[model samples]
Target chain A: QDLALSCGTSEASADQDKKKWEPDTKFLKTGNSIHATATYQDPSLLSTVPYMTARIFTAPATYEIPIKGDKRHLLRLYFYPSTYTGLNISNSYFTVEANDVTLLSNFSAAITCQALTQAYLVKEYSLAPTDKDVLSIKFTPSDKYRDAFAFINGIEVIQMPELFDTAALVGFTDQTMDAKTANLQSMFRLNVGGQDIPGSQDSGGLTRTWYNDAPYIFSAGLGVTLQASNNFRINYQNMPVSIAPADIYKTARSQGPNGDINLKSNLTWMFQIDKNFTYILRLHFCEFQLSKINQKVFNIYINNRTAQADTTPADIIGWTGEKGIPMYKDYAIYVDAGEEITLQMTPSTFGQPEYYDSSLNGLEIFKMDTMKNLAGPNPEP
Target chain B: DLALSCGTSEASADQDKKKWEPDTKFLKTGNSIHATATYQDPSLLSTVPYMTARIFTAPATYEIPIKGDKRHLLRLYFYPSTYTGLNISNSYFTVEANDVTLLSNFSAAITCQALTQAYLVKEYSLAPTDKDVLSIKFTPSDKYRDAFAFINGIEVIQMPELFDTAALVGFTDQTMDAKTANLQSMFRLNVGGQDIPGSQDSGGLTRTWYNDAPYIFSAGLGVTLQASNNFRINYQNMPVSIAPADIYKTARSQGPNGDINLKSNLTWMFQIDKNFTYILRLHFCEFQLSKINQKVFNIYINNRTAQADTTPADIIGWTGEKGIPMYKDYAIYVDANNGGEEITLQMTPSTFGQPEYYDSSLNGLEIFKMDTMKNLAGPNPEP
Candidate 1:
C-alpha cells in the first residue's frame, strides 16, 4: 500500500515517475482542519505542487492515514521552511508524533535549514509492523516562541519490506538486538564509491535515494574507489533481493593494494549523528574479484571499538561462499556524546592473507529511538 | 633580498617577513612621480607592496645584478588602484626583461578581474644571460589617452632550474625541452589547499601558490580533502625543494560517483596565451593510498590525452614507499582558437579492466609559458 498527500492544496500532482499525490482534504475527516498557506518559491525546489503549499496549525492536529495492518512502512515527511503569508517563519516551532512516538520535538524548520544550509528538509522513518489499521500522525505547536505554529508540506506512507532483523551489539559479546520490532529513523544510506542513485532507479520499488560516500570520508586516506569486473555480476544469492540494489553492490571502496600502507592506516568514514541512541550500522559487501577465502580480510570498528575482530573477520568469501555474491552485516552501536561517529576498517593482520585490504560496497545507518522517542532538538547555528 | 618596495621612501618588511628595499636606487631613467593608492582591498595582507605605487609617465628601466648562467625569477607586482592624475583603465603597458618582451599591452586591472583576484603579480623566469646586468623596462602604451605605467613592487632573484624536458601531450616520442627557454608563470596553484604566500614557499624562492577555485569548471568541481593531523607528509625519494609540504597535504579529487565520475571529467579551464607551448607541471603526493590500480585515470589537455590510467602507486614504484612527493610534466601547444585561446584540462576516471577505483585526483598544478626562441609575449585581452 502506498499513499502520498500534498498538504494544504486541493489539487493533485504526479511526482517522479507517475507517482500521484492527492491533497490532504480527503484525509481530514475528523481532526480539526488547520489554516493553509501558499509558500514562496525557492530555486532549490524541484517541484512546487507539494512543497510550495503547506498546512499551518496554530494548535494540535492529526492526520489519520489508513494502511495495511501488520506490515512495516516507510513514513516520509516533507518540509519547506519559507515565510507564509502573515506568519512569522521563525515562530514555526513544533512537534511531530506518529502513533504516540515522538518523531520531532520543538523543531523549527527555519533554524534547521539555517544550520544545514538546505532549502528544505525530508525526514524518513521506518514504522514497525503494527496490528492497527490506521496510522495517526499528530502535530503540536510548541509554546516556546511568541507565535509558535506547526506546518507540513507533504507526507507519504509507503509499505516497505522487512529490511531490518537481528544485529549484533557493538562492544558486547553474546548480545544482539531485535531490529525487526524497533522503529528506526533513516540517517544515512550511501553507495560507497558509486554515484548518486535516485529513488526512481531504486530496485524493487523501494523509492530510496543512495548518496555518494565521498563527502563522508574522514581524512586524506580516502583509500581507493572500485567498480566490479565485467565478468562478475552481483547476485543476491542467500540475501533477499529487497536488501539493496545491485547498483550499490557493484561498486566499493577499500584500503588500497599496498599491504604496508593498509596496515598502518584505516579506511575511516565519519558521520555527525545524534547522541545516546543505538544506531544500526549495516555494511554491505560483495567480493567480485577474489573467490578464495581470506584473500581479502579486514576488521571492522565502530566508534573506536571492534565490532568485527580480526580473529573472526569480515570475510566476504567465507560469508557468501563465492565471488559475485553479496552479503551484509549489521551492528548496533550506541553513541554517547552528540558528536561525530567514526566507522573504520583496517586490513586484518591475523589472517596473513594474500591481499591485506578492507572494503565496503554500501552502508546504511539508522538511529533507533530511545524511550520511544526518536525526536532530537533543532540544530544551532 | 632583491625585493623593492616601489614608491615607498624607506625600507620595510612584508607580511611574510621578507625584507624590501627602497626603489630610488634602482631607477635608472624616467620621470618618476610616486603616489599612494586611492584604496586598498580589505583582504590584502600587507601595505608594503600594495598600498603605494611608483607612477611612470614615460619609459622606465631598472638595472639589477644577475647571477651569470643561472635562471632568475623576475616578479612585477601591480595593485591597479587609482594613483594621483592617473586612471587605472588608461594604464596598459609593456614589460620587457633583458631584451625579450615579457608583457605587451598588459592591463593589471583587467587581468585581476579576469582572474578573480584582488592584486596581481606577473612572474617570469629569465634564462641564463651572458650580460652581467639584467634590465627591466616598463613603457606605457601610447594608444589610450593619459596612459601611464605604474608598479607597486619588483623582485629579481636567482632561482634553481625548475624546468627541463616535459613530455608533449598526445605525442609520446616528442618532448619540449625548456632548459634554455625564458618562461612566464601563468598560474601556480595549490589545488585544494589555501593560498601559500611567497614567504612560506620552500627553498626560499619566494613563490606564491594561489587557491585553485576560480579556474575550476562549473559543476564538475569535485571534492577537496585535507590531511588529518596524525598524517605526516614525507618527501621520501624526491627533494622537498620541488614543492612544500603544505602543497602536498591537500588535494582535489573526482567525487565518489563511479558511474557519474566516469562519465564527466574533472576539468579546469584557464585563459592563456595562444600559439605558445605551455609546460603543465602537475604536483602529486601519494599520501592517501599507496597501491596501484586502486585509483586510475586519464589526463587530457585540450581534449588530447596526456597521461593514461595512472595512480599514486607510480610514486611508490619509483621511490619504494608511500607519502613521497612526485610531479608529472606535460607540454602542450595551444594554437590560436578563434583569435584567442583558453586551455582546458580534464581528468576522467579510467573504466578499463575494472580498476579498484574509477577516480582521479590532483594536489597542485603549475602552468608556465615557454618562450618561442627569444619571444615571450601575448596580446592584450579584448577591452
Candidate 2:
C-alpha cells in the first residue's frame, strides 16, 4: 500500500520511523546516478542515505510507481541541492509532472532552499484517487538554460485515507467548494503554540510533520502562547483523530484577557503564496479553559476580508458542544494572484464573551490546483 | 567587565546578549592599527564581536587586569576578512597568554574554511595564575612574507572548576588530572537537540552548544527523543553550571530495531588535532527509563572500550531519582603516529549482558584539548 524509494543509490535503511526504503533503480528506468562531491555541511541534515546521492536526468525521465490507485495517495519528493560532480546547481531548473498534472514547472531547489534558509526541501501533495494501477512521475530539465539538468534524492508514495472534504467559501454567501476531488499541495502545517511535532508522533497512522508557528508570526502585537494544564486531555469527539495530532490541541496562542488591548490589535500572521491560487485554510481548535458558550469569541480575517463576517463569529463552544472537544473550521479563499496572504484574528464584542481573546491551536494551509495546476512560474535569479 | 571588542570605541551587544567592552583600555605595548568594517556572510550569526578588528604588523600585547587565582575562560575571536591594504592570505599568527603558547602558526582563514564557518572563536580554560595582569601577546608568523596578526574580540571570565580528574581510557588504574592543565574546547554539542544560544545558558556562561547532526557517522544516525511534556530536569547534585537544562531535555538514542540496533553502532566522527590528550564528557539524564538496567550500552573511544555496561539509570542511582543530570568524562590521547587527525566516539547496546531494552542514548557531549608543555598550539588546518 506504500512505497519508499531512495534515489540514485541501493543503500537502504530505516527512515524517519520504521519504513525501510528500496532503491530507485527498481522503479526508475532512466536517468544517470550522481554522488555528492562533498559531504553535507548543514547541521540539520544528518544521514547520507538519500540526501548524499541523487538521480540526475539531462533529458526527460520517468518513474512508474506501482500503487493502489483506488485510494488517494500522499506523494512526497525530496531535494538536496548539494554539490554534485560535473553539475552546477544554478544550471538546474526542471519541471515535474505526476499523472499528467504539473507538479513543478522550472523549479530550482537551490534557489528555493536558499531563500527559505533551509538545507533541504520536501514537497508533499495529495493526489486524487485514480483508476490506474500505476502512477507515472515524469521529470524534465528546462531547455531555456545552458547545460541544464534535473535531479531528485528521494520519493515516497503512501496510500492514505481521504483527508480533505468540502470547505465553505470565505467571502461568498453559503457557498462551499469541493476539495475531495481537487489535487492539493500542502503549503504549511503549523502547531501554533507548541514545539515541532515530528512524524513519529503523528496521530491515526498519518505520518505528518508539524512545524512551529513562531517564524510566520508578525508584528509587535504577537499574542501569548499557553499550554494546556498537565491534566488536560483533548477529546476528539467532534473532529476526526486523523485530522491533526493530540499535541496540536494541547497548546494555543491567544490574545490576552485584556479586552481593551485585544480590541486595539489583532493577532496577525503573514505567509508567502503564489498569486491567483485558491487555498484551503484549516484552523484547529480545542477549548480547555471555558466550557460554556460565549466564553471567548473572535473574528477571523483573511486578506483583510472578514472570513467569518457573513457567518457567525468563531467560537469554540459554539462549534463544539464541550470544552475539551476538538473541532476544525475550513475556509476556501482566492488570492487574486497576490504574492502574500495575511491572516488576522481579533476579539469580537457582539457576543459579550467572558474573555475578550482570540485563540488558535493549529493551522494548515493547502493550495487547490484544481484549474491550472500546482506549478508556479520559475523564480528569479 | 572583561569582554573586549577590539578596534572599536563603542560597546556593542552580541547575539548572545553579552555586552562587549571597548578594547582601548587594555593596550599595553607595540604599535597597532584598528580597522572597523562589516563583513557580510550568510553563516555569520552576529556582527558585534566580528565586525571590528585590531591589526598588527609587529608583535603586540594586551595587559588585561583580572582577579588572580581563579580559573578563567579566555576566548579569542577571529574573523578573517579583508581590511584596507591587507591580504587575508598573509595573515598567520601566534598567540600566547602569560608565557603559555595558546596558538602557534594559526590561520583563521584556513580554519574557518575547513570548518565551513564565517568566523571562529578559540576558547580556553586557563589555569589559575598568581599574576593579576595577564599579558596576551600576538605575533605575526616570521616565516611568511607580508605576514600580519589581527583580533576581533577577547573575553576573560572567572569560572568555577569545571574539570576534574578523568579516567584515562585504555589505561586501567590511570587518570589524568584535568584541573592542573589548561584546556582548549574542541566541540560542545547538545546531541539530538536544537542549538542552544548563549543567552539560554545557565550560570551566566555564554557558551553556545551546536546541534550534533553533521557529525553522525555514516547512516547510523539514530532517533532523537525529547523529554515528556510533564518531565522537569532535576540537576540534583550536579551543578547547573555544568550545562543548561535544555541539553538534558532531549537525547539521541538507537532506534527500536533491536537486531539492526545491535548490528549498527551509533557513532560520531570528529576531526581533531593529533598529539593531544582530549577529555570527552558525555552527559546523561534518564527521563524515559527509571529502573536500573532498563537500557544498558557500551561506550568506545577510537575503538577502545571506555565503558562496558553503561546505563542512564546510573544517574538515577546517583541522585536517588530520575531526571537528574549526570556526566562522565574520559581522557584519551591521540598519538600522531597511529592514525590521521580524526577520532570517533562509538556507542552500542550492550550485547555482553542482555538488558530490558537494547538501546543506547547520549544527551550531550563536550571534547577539550588538553595542554602539554605549557602549550596548546596546533598547526593550521589544511586549506
Candidate 3:
C-alpha cells in the first residue's frame, strides 16, 4: 500500500477530509515563514506544481515532522518558481538536514530550474524512521550566494505503511518480497481487466494507483465482460474484500477463443528500465466466464522463472460454479543482460490448451531501488 | 536512483523522468563528453567499467537537469590507477554544484592508492532558482597545487526522499573525514519477542538481533541467525537467553553469566565517524537471568567507563535489570569528546558481581548528536 502527500497545502483543493499535510505550527520551523500569494500559471503540466504555494523562508528555516509509528517513509519535495509576492526573487540557495543526518551541503534553486526547463522542481527520497520519533528537515542559505535565502514553495511528508501488494502475480514461488527489496518505490501499477485506475479510484484500502496495463503491451482478444449470471456467487462468502474488490474480476482480457496458448498467440509484455534491476511481477487472475474449476490453466513466465507452472482457474476460483473467485501472485525476479525478465502469459504446455486458456486481469511491475545487487551505481567505463 | 552517464569525454546519454538535462555547451569548454583517443584498460571494465574518459584540462563543467529544492547525492568518480602517466598526487580540483564546492581543493593521491578507487560524493539539498536545472562544474587548480582534471564518471541521483535527510550529511562527512565520528544503532532486541527488520534510508535504522529459540540457551553454539531477520550478533558462539518482557525482537540471557574468564570478556564494536563527538545511548534489561549480585556487570564507554575495572551500569535500576526498556545516554566524543574514534564497547565481570550472575543484556540503542546535531536539535547556531 502507498501513502500520498500533496505537500505544502493543508488539504487537496478538493478533498477537505484528507489530512495529508502536517500542521503549520508543528511542521514548520521558523521565524516569520509566510506563504506567497503566487499560483502556478501553467495548469497543464504534471505535478511539481504542488501545494507548497510559495511558503518562503527569508534567511533560515526547518521542518520537524513528527511521524506516526516507526517505519520507513517516502519523501517528495515539490518546488515551483513563481513571482509569489512574498519572495519574488529566485536564485534561492540552501542546505538541508534530517535530524542528525546531513542531506545537503549547499544547494542552488535558480540554477536547477534553468536546466530542467520547467518552472517546477521536485526531489524524492525514502528514509526509514528507526527508533526516533520526529524526523527533521532543515533549510539554511548557502553562504556563497549573494542574497542567499530559503524559500520552500512546498514540502511533503508521505507516511508509508509496509508494502502489501494484493492480487499480485510474482516470479518467486512463494510470492514474497524479501526485506532487502521491500522498500522499493513503485515503477508502474496496472489493472489488466479494467480501465486505468487513477490514484483516487484505487479500490484497495491501500491507496494503490493501478493504471491500465493494456497500454504498455501488445495484446490479443479484446476484453470480455463477465455476466452477472456467472459472477453471481463472487460474493462476500467466497472472495473477501481484503484481497481484492469483486469488480476487478467483472472484466478480463483473454486471448481470442481461437488464440491458442502457443508461442505465436501468447500475449507478452516486454520492456526494460535500468540495465540492472530486481523486479516484482504482480499478476492478477480471475476466470471471467462460468469457466469450470479446471477449464482455464495458464503458466506465467517472468523471464525464465515459471511463476505459475500449471495454475488453473480453480487454483483460484475453486468452486466448480464459482466465477469471480480471483487471486494474485507476487514474485521477485533479478534481471541482468544474460538473464532478462520479459513477462509472457500462455496456457500450460502440459494442460489441455483449449480448456485452460491463458488469461489475465492485471499486471504490476516494480523495480527495487537498491544498489547492492544492481550494476555499479558507477557511470560508464 | 540516479543513473551514471560516463560521457565520451564530452558527450553522454542520460535517462531520467525526474529530468536532469545538462547544458550541452559544456562541450565547447571541456573535452567533448566524448573522446575515444584516451584509453582505459579493457579489463578494468569488469569492476570500474564506468571509466571511459580521462582529461588533461580544467573547468570541466556539466549542467545536468534536475528539479529544485530537492537534495541530490552526487558521486564524482576518478581512478588515478593503472594508467602509466596518471599520477594522482599531481591531480587537484574543486567540484562545484548548486554553488557549494562539493570537493574543496581535493587531491586524489591522498585518497586512493592501490585499494579503494577514487570516488567523491557530495550531498546537497538544492534550492532551485525558480528553475529546473542545476550546475555541476569542476575547476582544476594550480594556484595552490595542480594537474589534469581527470574524471571517470559523474552521477547525480535524485535521492530517495528521506524524512531525516539532515542526518545523512553526518554519514558522508564522518565517512570522508576519518577524524569525524558518527554513531549507528547496532542492535535492538525485544528480548522474548519476534524479530524486527531493518529500515532503509532510515538514517540506517537497521534490524534488531533476536533469539528465536527463547528458552534454549546454547552453552556451546548459537542459532545460525537465518533469513532477512538475521540477528546482528558480533559475538563468538557460546550463548544462553530468555524472557516474555517485550513482544518485539525479544529474548535474552543473563545470570548464569557464563564463566567470567578471559574468554568471557565481551566486545561490541560500533564503527563511528572519526573526528566528531558522539552521544551513545545504550538500552538494557534484565530479561535473561536477574538476581541480587548475579545480573550485575560493569558498562564501559571506550574501554574506560570510569577508566577502571569497576564502573557499575548506569541503567535506571538499583540492581539494574529489566526496569522495562530504559536507555542511558552517554556523551562520548569519538575522537575528541573524552576519547578516540572508531569506537568499540566491551563488557566483562568485575569484583562486585556474583560469579554466576555477572552479565550484561542490551534491549535497544541510540546515538545523539555529535555537537552539530545537538545544537540543530535545539536552536539555530549561526546567530
Candidate 4:
C-alpha cells in the first residue's frame, strides 16, 4: 500500500552504508548519487526518528519504478530546500515528466522553499502510463532557474484501491469492506468512543498513525456511542480488516436522547474546506447504544438535503446480521470556491420510535485534487 | 490531425455560447433557449450543465452528419444547469436520432439527479440510414416541469476498423473506393492562416475542430494572408452545419491587394506526424464572388492535380447551387517519407483558363484522418 524511497540522505544512512535500523523500512539509493548537502537546523541535519531528509543532485537523474501498466497511481514527490553548508538562496531548479505529458516545467526550489521558508513541498499527480508499465520520473537541470541542481528529499508511492482506476473495466466499488480504501483523502481519523492510537501502537502490517479528532469538532452535545445492555453481537464477515481495525469501531458517538438535535441548528459540525472544488463527505455510523432496529432515527443534512433518514445501523444489522459494523455514506458536495461547509443531523420528523440524537461515529471530507468539473471537462479537446 | 479547430480562432466562441456570431450560417436560433454550467471533484468528467432548449409549437431539431454509412459512437450529455420554469423541479424531454431514440421524455432534473450524472458517462452506439446523417429532435415532455427537453453536449465520434462490444449491422463494408466521401475531419483552417473568430470552438458541437494556427509553417513567405468577418453565404441558404456564413470571410489570397499580382504560386506547408492517408477538402467561396468569368485557378496536393482549371462560380453552377460554397476533394496519402517530409499544397494560375483570374483564394480547408485505434476508449470521449 505504501512505497517510500530515500535519496542521498537516506534517512536510514548516515554513518556510511555500514549499518542502519528502523521498524523494517529500507533506504533505497535512487541512482548514482551526486550528493549535495544543505543545513536545516544547523550542525548536520541528519535524519533522526521523526525528522527526515533526502539526497541532492547537482545534475540530472531519475527515479523509475516498474508498476503494472494496467492501473493508475498517486505519485508523491517530497522536497526540502534549506541550509546545511551554504546551498545558496536559490539552490536548485528542474523539470519533471510522466509518460508523454509534461508534469511540471521550470520548477524552482527558491520559489518553492525559502526563496521564502525552506519549507518542504510535495507535488502529487495521478497518472496512467500510456506506454511502458514502469513510471519513469526524470529530474534535470533547467536553463531557467539559477544555482541549478535538482533534488528530491523523499518519495512515496501508494497504490490506491482498484475502484479508483478508471481504466479498469467494471471498476466500481464493491460494498464488501465498506469500501473506505477508495481514492480518498482522510480529513479526520477518530476513534469515536475510544482514544486515538499512535502509529507505533497501531496493530497493522503497515505503520499507520491515527490522530484523535477531538479538536476538529466545531459543535457537539451528545456523547460518543457507548456500550448498551446485552453486549450486542458484531459481524466481521463483511468487514474487510485492511480498511478498519477493531479499535476504530469499538465505540461510537451518538446524538441526543432528549431530541434537542432537531431544534439546535448549531448542533452541527463545521469543516473549512477548499472552495470551488468538490468533496466526498463521509459520515461513519454504528449502533452501539441502540439495541433494536429503528429505535433511533435521524435525518442527515449535508449542505442541505435529506441524504438518508428513517434508518439506523441496527436496521441494517437486523437482516444483514452485521452488528456493531461501522457503515458510512459517501455523498458529494461542492464548497463554493470560498465557503464553509456543515454536516448536521436533524431528528426525523416522523421521529424515532424512541427519542435519540443524530450520531456520527466518524467523519471525513476529502477535497479533490483533480478538477473533475461537474459540467465535464471544458470540452478542452 | 485535430481537424476540427482547423480554421477557427482558439476558444473565442467560448465567451458566449448563446450570442456568439457564427462565422457561417446561423443554426442556433430561439432566443429563449436556456443553457449553463458546475464543479464536483470526485463525481466524474462530464459536460457542464449548460443545458439549452427553446419552446416550440412545431418541432425543434439539431443535426450532425458526415459522409459515412458505417457505425460510429454517439455520446449524449445532459446537465440541469438553469431551471427553465419557475420552481421547475423537473425537466423532461424527448430526443430522437433517426431510427434510434437517444432519450425519451427523460427528466434532466430527475434522470441525472441535478449533478450526479456529471460524475459519470452514459454511452450508446448507433448507425442508421447508411446514406450518412444523424439528426436529433428535441421535444418537450408534458409530464415534467416546463414541457421542454434539452441537452448539455453531444459527441459523434468515428470508430476505427475493429472496436465494438455489441457490433451493429452495416458495421463495415470492403469498399475503400467510397471511403473518401466520409473523410473523417482531421483539421480545418481559415488558411492564409488567420483564425475565423465567428465559429464555435472545437468542443462547441462536440466536434474536435482546430484553428490552423498551430500547424501552419510558411517557409519562404510567398503567400498573402486575407481574412474578413463579413463574407456572405449566397442566398441559396445552406445548412449552417454544412456551410456557415463567415467561413469564406478569410482566404489565402494570391496577392496583397487587387493591384498587386504574384502569379506563380502561394504555398502552405501542413506539418503532419509521419505519413498518413487523408482526404483533403479545399473550400473556395471566392470572396471574389463577382468575378464570374475572371476568377479561375487550380489546386495541387503534394504538387499533384486535385482538380484542374476551375472557377468557384463554375463549380457551384455545375453543382447547381448558385453563388454558394464550393469545395474540391481528393484522396491524398502522405507519409513522413523520410525525416518529416514536407507535403506541399500549392495553388497557381491555371493553364486551362485566361490568365486574368490570378486571384486564387481559399475560404476553408480540411485534412481528415482516420481513427487509428478502433478500441472503445480511443480518442477519449471526455476531452
Q: Please report the candidate that would top TM-score against the real structure.
A: 2
Tens-digit lDDT string for candidate 4 (B1-383): 00111112222223234222111111223433432332333443222323232333324654343323334545554444444342323445566655454455555556445334532233444442443235556677665545655444455554422211211111121122323222234466765544543234321233323345444444434354443455455634332344344555555556644334334555666644345445566666654444344555566667665545343223433334334666655555555542244456666555455545555666677665432322111111111
* Candidate order (TM-score): 2, 1, 3, 4
Q: Which stretches of candidate 1 lie over 4 Å from their true place?
A: A16-18, A30-39, B1-383
User: What is candidate 4's TM-score against the reference?
Assistant: 0.37
Q: Write the per-residue lDDT of candidate 2 for residues B137-169, one digit (tens) a residue.
A: 999999986888999999987677889999888
Tens digit per residue, CA lDDT, model 2, A1-381:
466787877555566454456677778766554534334556678555566678888889988988767778889998988777667887899999988678998899989888788788889999898778899999999998889888898898876667799998887777998998789999999999899998756654456889999899895766889898864656664355667877899898998867899989989989988777889999999888888988888999988876774338899988888887888888999888477788899888875778888899999999998563898764443
Candidate 1 per-residue C-alpha lDDT over B1-383 given as tens digits, one digit per residue, 9 for 90 to 100: 37998998888987888889888756777568888987878878888788888988889987664434457888888898767677788788888988788887888888777766678888898887744457788888888768878899999875767777998887766787888889999999999999998778986688989899889985767989787786777764465557889998889998777888878878898888889988889987767777766676778888877876432223344445557678888998888542248778888777665667777788899999988867787876553
lDDT string, candidate 3, A169-247, tens digits: 3444445555432434345566665765543333323334455566556546443433334314343333333344444
DockQ of 4: 0.01
Assess the local accuracy of residue A138 in candidate 2 as a C-alpha lDDT between 0 and 100.
92
Error of 1 at A177 (Å): 1.3
The iRMS of model 1 comes to 35.8
TM-score of chain A of each: 0.95, 0.95, 0.63, 0.64
lDDT of 3 at B2: 33
**Candidate 3 chain B, poorest ten consecutive residues by summed lDDT:** B374-383
Better of 1 and 4 by TM-score: 1
User: Which tens-of-lDDT digit does each residue in A162-237 have in candidate 1?
Assistant: 8899999988897998888898999999999899887755654567889999989985778988998652456554
Instruction: Please state the error at residue B209 of candidate 4 in Å.
Output: 72
C-alpha lDDT (0 to 100) for residue A86 of candidate 1: 72
Listed in order, each prediction's TM-score against the native is 0.49, 0.50, 0.38, 0.37
Query: Is 3 or 4 the stronger prediction by lDDT?
Result: 3
